[PDB]
Amino acid sequence: SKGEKLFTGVVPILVELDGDVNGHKFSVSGEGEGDATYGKMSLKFICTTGKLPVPWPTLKTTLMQCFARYPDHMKQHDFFKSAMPEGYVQERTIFFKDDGNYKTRAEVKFEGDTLVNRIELKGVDFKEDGNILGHKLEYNAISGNANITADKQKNGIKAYFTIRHDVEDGSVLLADHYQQNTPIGDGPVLLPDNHYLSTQSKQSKDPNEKRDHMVLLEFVTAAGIPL
């Protein structure tokens, strides 16, 4: 594969999410730019249906690991770019401790020069008086590691990690992520040695934006193999 050559410059990003959580339906759209040379994504997401019925932080991991910076010595472990431009399917289950779960399915692919992330999200067994449907989570930055492993049987990768969401009562809401990625195309892909993606995030608002929205500046770096 020569998928990595598609990311050497600034790439426009389009995101589309259709969600249903305990029957509360919503849509999100997002745009921005990825600059994988520096591991960077600059993004803005809008709830297109009015008020988001779950907190923005709970959707962040769902709303493009193809934009990670793999250091030169780790290039042979970058499944995400190797699958381009045909793309990959990303599936997760996210278990919120003592609350419901999200089941997600996404297709991440190029549509001409645009990297498009099209997502379906289904959430069930949430508590209406809980920290999620009750909107009791802090609007702050999520940072941390995604652990990546080869899935030889599916010619893809699996990932796992736990996000710690701050609750406005000073407690923490744990969100256990289980991830599977499979190439959409039939061509060759890179199957990695074990490693992780480290994300640094800055979360903000646009003071001119009336719509329910999220602004992110993300930097994502591959790590866990020396040299």
Author numbering: 2 to 64, 68 to 231
From the paper:
Recently, a fluorescent protein based on an anionic tryptophan (Trp) was developed and was named WasCFP. WasCFP was further improved to enhance its stability across a broad range of pH levels and temperatures, incorporating 13 additional mutations. This improved variant, which exhibits strong green fluorescence under physiological conditions, has been named NowGFP. Spectrally, NowGFP exhibits green fluorescence (λex/λem = 493/502 nm) at physiological and higher pH levels, contrasting with cyan fluorescence (λex/λem = 429/475 nm) under acidic conditions (pH < 6).
In the case of the orthorhombic (P212121) crystal form there are eight molecules inside the unit cell, and two molecules are in the asymmetric unit (chains A and B). Similarly, we refer to chains A and B in the orthorhombic form as Orth(A) and Orth(B), respectively. For the comparative study of the two crystal forms, we chose the orthorhombic crystal structure obtained at pH 9.0 for comparison with the monoclinic structure since it has a higher resolution (1.7 Å). Two of them come from the arginine–aspartic acid salt bridge between Asp180 of Orth(A) and Arg168 of Orth(B). The other two are from Tyr182 and Tyr164 of Orth(A), which are connected to the main chain of Val176 and Asp173 of Orth(B) through hydrogen bonding. Compared with Mono, a significant shift of the main chain is observed for residues 170–176 of Orth(B), which mainly involves contact IIAB and the loop between the β8 and β9 strands. The evidence that Orth(B) has a more unstable structure compared with Orth(A) or Mono is that the r.m.s.d. from ideal angles, average B factor and solvation free energy all show the highest values for Orth(B). In the case of the Orth(A) and Mono structures, the key residue Lys61 has ∼80% k1 conformation and ∼20% k2 conformation under a high-pH condition (pH 9.0).
